Design a protein around this ligand. Structure first.
Ligand SMILES: [Mg+2]
Length: 528
DNA sequence: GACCACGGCGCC
DNA sequence: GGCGCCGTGGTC
């Protein structure tokens, strides 16, 4: 309540306001600090930002990123958001956290500062006795905050000219497809409108409408529905190609070039730390965790991500991290042997259940896929699909046992846990409507494996980052079970070696963790 | 110019 | 299973 002049005492909680949500692009409108119960408001923010030793408060990372932008080394420290997020992943927003635990998220810097000091005490207390959740805060989450700050502030270098050339070329190909579609349509119309396209296909042309949209109940025109109509008419062939190009052009090719920062000449994403229910990171503004890789055009877009002059990119990907984690949690002897002997999984899992059929189940068992789905995709009847599943479990029994065990606990305790003890509360496991319940169950037993893979990758980044500094290298991107680094080409070899070891042995399980590494000048070449 | 819901799709 | 962003359509 008391107002002392700037600056504040040591260890004060920071509050701040931005002109916009992206710290790399925002203008610092005001900052303040709180300690004990009194507030310190800065006359001139950018100047005053140098008096601080660490950014400590709600959204600590954001301010830290902006400080880095200004050439200031202001590391992020404590953040009540991370405490609330560990107590319950559904706590994803300051406004929400405040409205739940107390206080009010306003747009006045001083008010935000006081809010941080109070909410921190509150939540830090609520974390009394919860040692495993406390271990995650000290040893993983809080330290990762500072790593992510350097990733966002470093950005990635982009080949802008390359994407300009590619935009025109792709624009050229879209023109040919739009044309031949209008020809078979008998008239022109908006192809980007699924409402217009529904009419031409299912009414004008005499095509069968197989499925409906969720909320409104219209005849769907999704790629699945379309693929099924591939034989009925040559028009859908071209529409499927049209969608492919438009998607890749509207989302990646056109926008990314226009998001280069002038001060850096690089592209800057945001890594959100309290955004998912399983403990995963998410990415936005822009999302660099969903850059295309599959199709030919998609691969060309990924070549536009390049290293600095005199530097190389280093790409490290875990192999079947989620399946290897399931082996550890399930304790299933057989599945462990497959990994322990270091053999190709999707062939050994076939041999020990009697190729294609082997993969789809391993992929889908984590998601608890429908017996009808395996029948639909693998192009096999319902009974053969339904039998294969029972056959998979007869081979890996402790897996099925682990699923049933997991759900029983979730019904009793109200939550499920990862190996390190990250909680997700899943309510409707005792729902009396089967579809609601069985949906909640799928959410339930998946969380520990996705969440445990997320814990290991997070922990590796924490351990790796100090080592990269000793060698003058950088952490650039993260894609759930992948990392992209940047080293000087003189030392990139050694960095790839060390990074691999750090990731693999981050937390020895019942099986080994394997990492595939590659070095290239662009994101694409650094894998092939 | 802002925001919103929906269908649709990119990635792990 | 877990995300975020696109254009369309509609509203203020
Ligand atoms: Mg949606």
């Amino acid at each position: 309540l008391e107002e002392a002049p700037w600056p504040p005492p040591e260890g004060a909680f920071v509050g701040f306001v931005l002109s916009r949500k992206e710290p790399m692009w925002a203008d610092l409108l005001a900052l303040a600090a709180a300690r004990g119960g009194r507030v310190h408001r800065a006359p001139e923010p950018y100047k005053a930002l140098r008096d601080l030793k660490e950014a400590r408060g709600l959204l600590a990372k954001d301010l830290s990123v902006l400080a880095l932008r200004e050439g200031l080394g202001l590391p992020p420290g404590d953040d009540p958001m991370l405490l609330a997020y560990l107590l319950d992943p559904s706590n994803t927003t300051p406004e929400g956290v405040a409205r739940r635990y107390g206080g009010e998220w306003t747009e006045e810097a001083g008010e935000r500062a006081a809010l941080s000091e109070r909410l921190f005490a509150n939540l830090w207390g609520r974390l009394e006795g919860e040692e495993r959740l406390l271990w995650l805060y000290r040893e993983v989450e809080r330290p990762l905050s500072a790593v992510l700050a350097h990733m966002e502030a470093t950005g990635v270098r982009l080949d802008v000219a390359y994407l300009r050339a590619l935009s025109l070329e792709v624009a050229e190909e879209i023109a040919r497809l739009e044309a031949e579609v209008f020809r078979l349509a008998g008239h022109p119309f908006n192809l980007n409108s699924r409402d217009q396209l529904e009419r031409v296909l299912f009414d004008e042309l005499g095509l069968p409408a197989i499925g409906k949209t969720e909320k409104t109940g219209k005849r769907s025109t999704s790629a699945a529905v379309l693929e099924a109509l591939r034989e009925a008419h040559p028009i859908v062939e071209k529409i499927l190609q049209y969608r492919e190009l438009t998607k890749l052009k509207s989302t990646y090719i056109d926008p990314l070039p226009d998001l280069i920062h002038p001060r850096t000449g690089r592209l800057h994403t945001r890594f959100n730390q309290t955004a998912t229910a399983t403990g995963r990171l998410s990415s936005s503004d822009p999302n660099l965790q969903n850059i295309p890789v599959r199709t030919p055009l998609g691969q060309r877009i990924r070549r536009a991500f390049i290293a600095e002059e005199g530097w190389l990119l280093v790409a490290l990907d875990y192999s079947q991290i989620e399946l290897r984690v399931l082996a550890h949690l399930s304790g299933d002897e057989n599945l462990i042997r497959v990994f322990q002997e270091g053999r190709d999984i999707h062939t050994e899992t076939a041999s020990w259940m009697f190729r294609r059929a082997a993969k789809t189940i391993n992929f889908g068992v984590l998601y608890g896929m429908s017996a009808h789905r395996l029948s639909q995709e693998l192009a096999i009847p319902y009974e053969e699909a339904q039998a294969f599943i029972e056959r998979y479990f007869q081979s890996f029994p402790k897996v099925r046992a682990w699923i049933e065990k997991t759900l029983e606990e979730g019904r009793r305790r109200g939550y499920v846990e990862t190996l390190f003890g990250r909680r997700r509360y899943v309510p409707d496991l005792e729902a009396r409507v089967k579809s609601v319940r069985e949906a909640a169950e799928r959410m339930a037993f998946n969380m520990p494996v996705q969440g445990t893979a997320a814990d290991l990758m997070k922990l590796a980044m924490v351990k790796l980052f100090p080592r990269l500094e000793e060698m003058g290298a950088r952490m650039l991107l993260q894609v759930h079970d992948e990392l992209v680094l940047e080293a000087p080409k003189e030392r990139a070899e050694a960095v790839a070696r060390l990074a691999k070891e750090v990731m693999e042995g981050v937390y020895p399980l019942a099986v080994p963790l394997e990492v595939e590494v590659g070095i290239g000048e662009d994101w694409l070449s650094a894998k092939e």
